[PDB]
Amino acid sequence: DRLVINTQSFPNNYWDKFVKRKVMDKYGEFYGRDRISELLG
Amino acid sequence: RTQTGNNTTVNIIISTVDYLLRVQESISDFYWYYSGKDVIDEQGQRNFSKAIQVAKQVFNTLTEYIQGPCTGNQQSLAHSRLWDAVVGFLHVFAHMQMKLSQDSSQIELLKELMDLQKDMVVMLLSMLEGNVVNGTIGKQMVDMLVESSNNVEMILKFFDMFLKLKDLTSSDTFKEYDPDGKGVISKRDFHKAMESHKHYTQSETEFLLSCAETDENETLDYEEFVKRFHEPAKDIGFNVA
Ligand SMILES: Cn1c(=O)c2c(ncn2C)n(C)c1=O
């Protein structure tokens, strides 16, 4: 799952993808905002 | 305390309480003198160290006055004055670390001063011990503390800074950050190392960078910047903790 991090429809049957932006806001200001968001998408 | 057997008597513990009150007031005005110029000569330092030794000694007496759980000793101390003198001590320490955070001149007296804080709080916890439910004397101590809570902040967060930043300096923006890891890491090297950490305020980390003392070009030692007193400071903060 180190290779599923960037994947597009990431919770394709789970819940919601807004959690990705949520944890970007948990962490991207600390380390890389545009780096880790692009690492997700 | 009591000296019951004679006709008349005294309570010598109250006498030493007021003596250290006078001592406290003297040291506080010494601070008030030095609080403006802040370029402190040899003389005031070396006599001040002797005054520090007095404070150390009288706290040693105080501790051994409550060496055991001697109760009426604690009762007199609960009704004693001394808490305000402690408050003024905290007030001294709060600004005192910051002026003493600079030079080779400073660090000796700073070491003695933080030593004195450690002994004072040792005195405090030693008289603390006899509590049961929440501690009436402990309630009194809460009154003293959260009364003087503001100057507690400076010393405690100073401890936090010096502790966590001797802790950070291992690696992963430090040891690999140069080849050797001696401390040829430059000033702004460490500054942006802190920025990449993004843990602390920029103000006090760059204040630490002001106390990095400019290792002849830009660099900064690992231990000799912080650790050599920070682990003493770790002991002290352990006591207060
Ligand atoms: C999208 N979503 C949720 O977000 C969710 C949930 N149960 C709890 N949450 C929070 N279910 C069933 C769900 O479908």
C-alpha neighbours within 13 Å on the C-beta side of residue B189: 24
Taking the centre of ligand 1 as the mean of its atom positions, its distance from the CA of residue A14, in whole angstroms, is: 8
- Between CA B238 and CA B241, with CA B240 as vertex, the angle to 5 degrees is 60
Chain B hits for A30, CB-CB cut-off 8 Å, are 198
- Supply the residue whose CA is at minimum distance from atom 13 of ligand 1: A15
The full DSSP string for chain B is ---TTSSS---HHHHHHHHHHHHHHHHHHHHHHHHHH----HHHHHHHHHHHHHHHHHHHHHHHHTSS--HHHHHHHHSSSTHHHHHHHHHHHHHHHHHTSS-HHHHHHHHHHHHHHHHHHHHHHHHHTT--SS-HHHHHHHHHHHHSHHHHHHHHHHHHHHHHHHHHTTSSSSTTTSSS-SS--BHHHHHHHHHHHT-S-HHHHHHHHHTT--BTTTB--SIIIIIHHHHHHHHHHHHH-
Helix, strand, or coil (residue A22): helix
A30 touches B: beta carbon within 8 Å:
yes
From chain B, pick out residues whose CB is under 8 angstroms from the CB of A35: none
Structure tokens at B110: 């700073």
Yes or no: say if B90 and B155 are a contact pair by the CB < 8 Å rule: yes
Which chain A residue has its CA at the smallest distance from B193's CA?
Answer: A31
CB atoms within 10 A of CB B6: 7
Q: Solving technique for this entry?
A: cryo-EM
**Is residue A19 helix, strand or coil?**
helix
Residue A16: CB within 6 Å of ligand 1? yes
